[PDB]
């Protein structure tokens, strides 16, 4: 006999429990609603049995039914009180079980009536576990109910401790419902927040460098052509320049612009800016003065380090310090007093952001120190090593080249433009000088694999999708990834096999990588999503662009971690390696350069003849993209003019390699234009001229190219020039990079045989 109120919100009314209870001639009132004290279905009730009831009973009821309200909670009850107990048992790797217990004032803290341990298998899904747990607790209830109703079971207190979860705690994990135990813990291990006690970065870059100098002062720090500087020599010179900089009022977090070509003076001035206390802003002297003015405007830089050669390219915009004027260097050669702390800026580099002119990416000392401190032991760089300073001065590839190796006591070899494009000669230099390790952009690196090289032990590549891995050296090859906003690379991969999609590898020190969906929730391993970065790699954000910083540098709503929303799509592979999958937004990597097409379209448009422009990135069927500038106009505009037009405001790498005239743009009914629709794509007298035409035909993917056509106007870019040079070397005679631009048609090139007939 006796009446039982069965409370549930998730279990059905045909539960094994309910059917069993009335089988024993209890009338079981089933209730799936919220109840209060005065409620009409509470007067003649003897037992309350709650199973997965989604509300808390007001204490008046639990007090009126002391000892007669039992709850079924599928958890080893000290552990995983509250919601989603089985899920949390797995994730938090707690003991597993089910508990029948008495209800109290608080959430599941009442004394245990019956409890029993249960086990999950690695291959059970989260839903499987949930069911197995329910099945277990229902049968436990059925076996022991007779004992409970007769009150012959001694209740015992739960052991102190345990965990508790509310409904929302599982939001972040909402996409994991169908995952298995193995996959879920694997996912956990990959994204598990490190345990407290992880060591923070306690020093700034220039601080660690000074240490490196103290230990190996007479080792060669940097080499340019025949000239070189030791660590002691380099440290002292930078110090002298640094004192002057601080004397002119440079303070921590101050921007100091540097406008120089690759040289010893460049390394000296960079180090001087750090040691002085501020952060350096690299300004390519071959940039349009307008562009140079802008970088100087956006940056608050009151001081500019430059040579007499490039001085007015700043157009009096800023106070100038000549790196070749002896007045610029102080007598003092001792290391400056430290005034910078690790979260201070170390440098500011401009990259193409999503909208407007350009963004100044702020990178901090601890960021840079983290990357170097990872780099040295990872690649086992010793003072015995020698590294090439290849990448341009305004991109973090140079930061990779310069900083990581100086802290290892290795020697930097400045690559002058003399060999920069001629990789055959660069290779010879390497074999001659014994260049053991360096970073080459994907475009250069893929071409450098062709060189007969015995010099290298390790080469690192990144910044564009790596396609080729066949190489003629015995050195190891590495592919890394990382946006400029997160301090050079956050992820590294050792290329061991060929791949259709070469992974970008695993995260570096003090960094975690999260693949999240649009709701910012975890994606299962193997499942694509947006790539999020967490840790020491994150910069301060965009200079004077706080709104944009807020968008890309988010505080995660469920986790509260500062995270960088890359805009990159990616996935975890089973081996833990990350695989890059492109981007939804129209932002592209052109020859390793970050490029927003919408940054170029407006400069194209203010041309007095065109009225509408869109520029797109297209593939070479080699897996990477080139820029095409689409413009509407009365008549075709000569490629040369457009190039110079844009060239007055934009850096050369931003200038498209193809321009397409259209009389009209195709339009979708909804929107302005449908991008998808835009179309895609004189014999020589002597035979020597002919034998130049076909190498040219190959390099530009052109059949039977006419001699009188301009190299640039036929899709020529720097890498296409490089390939042409080596193709002219392997089966022909030698040509320089700069010579090719002065003589861009084959006709002028044919004239080059005057140079060797003169010899
Ligand atoms: P032309 O393109 O003008 O000749 C230049 C080129 C491609 C031959 C090569 O020298 C070059 O300068 N390539 C791009 C240089 C660069 O630094 N791109 C940014 C690097 N991208 C990244 O993702 C890096 N930040 C990480 C470290 C891989």
From Swiss-Prot:
Activates valine (or leucine, but much less frequently), and then glycine and catalyzes the formation of the peptide bond in the first step of peptide synthesis. This enzyme may also play a role in N-formylation of the first amino acid residue in the synthesized dipeptide. Two module-bearing peptide synthase with a C-terminal epimerization domain, which is probably inactive. Each module incorporates one amino acid into the peptide product and can be further subdivided into domains responsible for substrate adenylation, thiolation, condensation (not for the initiation module), and epimerization (optional). At the N-terminus, contains a N-formyltransferase domain that is probably responsible for the formylation of the first incorporated amino acid. The modification O-(pantetheine 4'-phosphoryl)serine is found at residue 718. Residues 683-756 form the Carrier domain. Belongs to the ATP-dependent AMP-binding enzyme family. This is Linear gramicidin synthase subunit A. Large multienzyme complex composed of 4 subunits; LgrA, LgrB, LgrC and LgrD. Linear gramicidin is a pentadecapeptide antibiotic produced during sporulation. Residues 3-145 are annotated as: GART. Transmembrane segments: none annotated. The gene is lgrA.
